[PDB]
Amino acid sequence: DIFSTWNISLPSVPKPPPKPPSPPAPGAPVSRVLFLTDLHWDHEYLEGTDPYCADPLCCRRGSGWPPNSQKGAGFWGEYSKCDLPLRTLESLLKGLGPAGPFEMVYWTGDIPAHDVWQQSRQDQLRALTTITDLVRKFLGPVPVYPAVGNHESTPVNGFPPPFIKGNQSSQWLYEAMAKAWEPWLPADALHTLRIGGFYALTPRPGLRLISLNMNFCSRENFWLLINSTDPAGQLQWLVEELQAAENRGDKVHIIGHIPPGHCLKSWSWNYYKIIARYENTLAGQFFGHTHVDEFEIFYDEETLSRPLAVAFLAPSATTFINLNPGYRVYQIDGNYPGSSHVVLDHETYILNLTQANAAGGTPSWKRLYRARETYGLPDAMPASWHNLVYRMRDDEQLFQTFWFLYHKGHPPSEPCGTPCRLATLCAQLSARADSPALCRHL
Ligand SMILES: *[C@@H]1O[C@H](CO[C@@H]2O[C@@H](C)[C@@H](O)[C@@H](O)[C@@H]2O)[C@@H](O[C@@H]2O[C@H](CO)[C@@H](O)[C@H](O)[C@H]2NC(C)=O)[C@H](O)[C@H]1NC(C)=O
Ligand SMILES: *[C@@H]1O[C@H](CO)[C@@H](O[C@@H]2O[C@H](CO)[C@@H](O)[C@H](O)[C@H]2NC(C)=O)[C@H](O)[C@H]1NC(C)=O
Ligand SMILES: *[C@@H]1O[C@H](CO)[C@@H](O[C@@H]2O[C@H](CO)[C@@H](O)[C@H](O)[C@H]2NC(C)=O)[C@H](O)[C@H]1NC(C)=O
Ligand SMILES: [Zn+2]
Ligand SMILES: [Zn+2]
């Protein structure tokens, strides 16, 4: 009973009848949006060190060395509890050309490495500014719209709400974020950013981007043990933004770090009803944090029967843990008046480390897969990802395809049996935390 239950009131405006978007006309323009998340840069990464140490994070000087030099940390990363060297990140931005030009970029937190015990505020800012300047160097004019992750501050997950004031607050972090991201965000967005770490703006006509600070929903944010009731009034603020976009007829993309399924109950539950209320206004939801390729389907609140939205959970750039580095690109309905702004398809690129770390190897980022093609989907709409889940329940060969891509082409040695399957398939339907009914049909 540590966390209380609370409610958020929706405006008196009646909900318009549900009208799921219609597919775009033949040959309509399509925009490409890059999605980066969980870069996790370890400035202490050292090739050849022991990648299987006893500490939380290995592949460092303090991690020691292995007796067999063959078993030492690789040049571009390692398949272990290790984060990325600056090389692989800078190499990621270098090879973006083949991933087509981008209209926008979404960047969703987890920038520092997992060296929690020895991390200072100065170290965190050094990561923020270093990798921000690098991303802006390679993308140039293309704007990047970032979001706050759970590793940005110190201690990890410590994001006090606004009512906690003074030096103990996270104003040292939001202030630096406003300075670092000023080239990318307008003034009104920076104003909100400096306060609660979230903001809203219009990247293009008819679209409204909302970047949420999901640390106010995290079970790990120890600060929320004081008061977990809509910290920073973010959910209430979200309702006002969504309702205002409904009035203007705009569409909304929401971005964040922790997907709403991994949130505290009340936050996740209140979030669930806001989605359902503004299903016509929402055009996309993009999160990260999980480091793995996934998605979460939303249903109508009362009966949990009609799927009405999907949140795409892109995979990490980092290897943590035993993963190939990869990134994501979304194909979205283009920039024209009659656009729905929805996700039409998406692609995933990786860097096969076994080939990049091999003697004489070279890092070449390649497309791992394209969703619709490999899952045989007529589109990327909620109903279509709903069918895919219950399809993977019936046959095994298709789930193994999903399970393989899950791990960015590098799944573990132990196979995923029938108890692992239901757990995985059930998570794809659990966009609302602590809701066992959502998996009744599994
Ligand atoms: C936690 O605080 C809420 C109200 O304030 C919250 O924090 C603000 C800084 C801002 O983020 C708001 O959006 C938040 O809601 C308390 O809610 C009160 O609840 C009583 C009855 O329980 C109600 O009569 C009051 O009107 C509420 N206050 C407001 C401002 O609406 C809540 O009680 C606090 N939690 C605990 C355990 O005390
Ligand atoms: C605000 O709080 C932070 C967190 O404790 C302080 O950070 C430390 O500051 C001292 C200098 O007084 C340094 O020696 C430590 O290395 C800092 N630690 C970390 C983790 O950053 C900071 O000093 C405080 N600021 C003020 C003005 O009191
Ligand atoms: C990453 O690269 C490795 C090495 O090229 C791939 O492993 C090889 O896979 C082929 C068939 O796919 C086998 O015949 C070789 O014996 C494998 N070599 C080694 C050293 O294991 C691996 O499939 C690649 N993975 C991805 C996702 O591209
Ligand atoms: Zn992470
Ligand atoms: Zn995270």
Numbering used by the authors: 167 to 608
Excerpt from the paper describing this PDB structure:
Acid sphingomyelinase (ASMase, ASM, SMPD1) is an enzyme found in lysosomes and in the extracellular space where it catalyses the conversion of sphingomyelin, a major component of membranes, into ceramide and phosphocholine. ASMase consists of an N-terminal saposin domain and a C-terminal catalytic domain.
We begin by describing ASMasecat, which was also crystallized in isolation. Its core, composed of two six-stranded mixed β-sheets surrounded by eight α-helices, belongs to the calcineurin-like phosphoesterase structural family (Pfam PF00149) and resembles recent structures of the ASMase-like protein, SMPDL3A. Like SMPDL3A, ASMasecat possesses an additional C-terminal subdomain (CTD) consisting of four α-helices that pack up against the core burying 1,795 Å2 of surface area, thus distinguishing it from most other phosphoesterases. In the structure of isolated ASMasecat, a phosphate ion is bound to the active site and forms several interactions with the protein and zinc ions, mimicking the scissile phosphate from sphingomyelin. As in other phosphoesterases the di-metal active site has octahedral coordination geometry from seven highly conserved protein residues, a water molecule and completed by the phosphate group. In addition, His317 and His280 are positioned near the bound phosphate as potential proton donors for the ceramide leaving group. Mutation of these histidines and assessment of enzymatic activity at acidic pH with the generic small molecule phosphodiesterase substrate bis(p-nitrophenyl) phosphate (bNPP) revealed that His280 assisted by nearby Asp249 is the likely proton donor, while His317 is probably important for substrate binding. The structure of isolated ASMasecat is unchanged relative to the catalytic domain in the open form full-length protein, but analysis of their crystal temperature factors indicated that interface formation reduces catalytic loop dynamics.
